[PDB]
Design a protein around this ligand. Sequence first.
Ligand SMILES: CCN(CC)c1ccc2c(c1)Oc1cc(N(CC)CC)ccc1C2c1ccccc1C(=O)OCCOCCOCCn1cc(CO[C@@H]2O[C@@H](C)[C@@H](O)[C@@H](O)[C@@H]2O)nn1
Ligand SMILES: CCN(CC)c1ccc2c(c1)Oc1cc(N(CC)CC)ccc1C2c1ccccc1C(=O)OCCOCCOCCn1cc(CO[C@@H]2O[C@@H](C)[C@@H](O)[C@@H](O)[C@@H]2O)nn1
Length: 271
Amino acid sequence: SSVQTAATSWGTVPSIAVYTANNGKITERCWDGKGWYTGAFNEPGDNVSVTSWLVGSAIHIRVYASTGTTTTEWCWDGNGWTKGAYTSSTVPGDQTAATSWGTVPSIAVYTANNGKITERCWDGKGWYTGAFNEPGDNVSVTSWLVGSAIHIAVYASTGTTTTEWCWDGNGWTKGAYTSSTVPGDQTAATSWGTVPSIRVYTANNGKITERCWDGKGWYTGAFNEPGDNVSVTSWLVGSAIHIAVYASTGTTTTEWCWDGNGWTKGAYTAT
Ligand SMILES: CCN(CC)c1ccc2c(c1)Oc1cc(N(CC)CC)ccc1C2c1ccccc1C(=O)OCCOCCOCCn1cc(CO[C@@H]2O[C@@H](C)[C@@H](O)[C@@H](O)[C@@H]2O)nn1
Ligand SMILES: CCN(CC)c1ccc2c(c1)Oc1cc(N(CC)CC)ccc1C2c1ccccc1C(=O)OCCOCCOCCn1cc(CO[C@@H]2O[C@@H](C)[C@@H](O)[C@@H](O)[C@@H]2O)nn1
């Protein structure tokens, strides 16, 4: 009954794209530092995830749009939306999460399908099946590079608990994350730097709460606002983190912004 959103951002301005799944359609709102506008993306789906990477100043976006029978990959490479090579069978209610790293890029896409999360990987030549296989109905992911080594954190929410699964190049292990919440989580994650710093937002029965990692234990963050559905993106300006959280209750999406000095309501509108 609430819309479902996905967001990505790039550069220091920043540029942002926010995708909203509402009543079977995914549409796009865009920011390049000078007002929100409606982007061209318009495709069927009940669930959306997104990742993006830069090649110099040129943005590349990958949108994973799930209907009741298929996930389709939609590619923006500066010159129109084109269907990509990624495909997966689904059933109604399936959820995805996507990350990418480098400029090749590498991509990992996680799908929660009938209570199981599985992983598909792009290495620059083809898609292959990843080792990840854990229970979950909802999923979010974030990733960070330490030199050339990718680190991945996946937040797997079953009916009862949210577990963090960590890839460090050698195998998947359970992470320190605890939700500080009861059963029924939907999550969104972002990360920055190489420690890393992680922020995980949980929507649970209409409330969003924040859990925080800066390298030395998980703690409850200042962010606390209503929402049935959450997404997030973040960007660095030198050493300073900026965060944009997209909180939705029904068809109303409110942006909340961290710029170093508390949460403020952002200029985002759905229009
Ligand atoms: C050799 C195998 N095939 C036939 C299956 C092939 C050949 C060339 C292209 C191919 C496919 O696909 C594309 C697709 C696009 N898109 C995105 C859908 C926008 C129109 C753009 C160009 C091509 C080109 C192309 C022709 C001439 C000059 C350049 C490029 C170019 O993409 O640049 C380098 C990367 O493509 C090289 C081909 O390598 C083998 C398979 N493959 C697919 C892609 C691009 O794949 C997309 O982006 C990936 C990151 C993933 O998200 C994929 O799922 C997605 O399909 N890169 N390699
Ligand atoms: C809620 C009431 N409490 C007691 C529980 C409280 C009060 C003050 C601080 C509190 C907590 O915590 C911090 C934490 C930091 N850290 C993390 C341990 C730095 C990495 C730093 C300062 C406080 C300060 C602090 C002291 C003096 C003056 C004001 C502030 C300040 O209000 O904090 C928020 C308002 O902004 C002040 C300047 O903030 C720039 C950097 N930064 C990071 C954070 C930590 O907040 C977490 O990370 C953010 C990125 C967001 O995700 C937050 O929602 C999240 O809580 N707070 N300040």
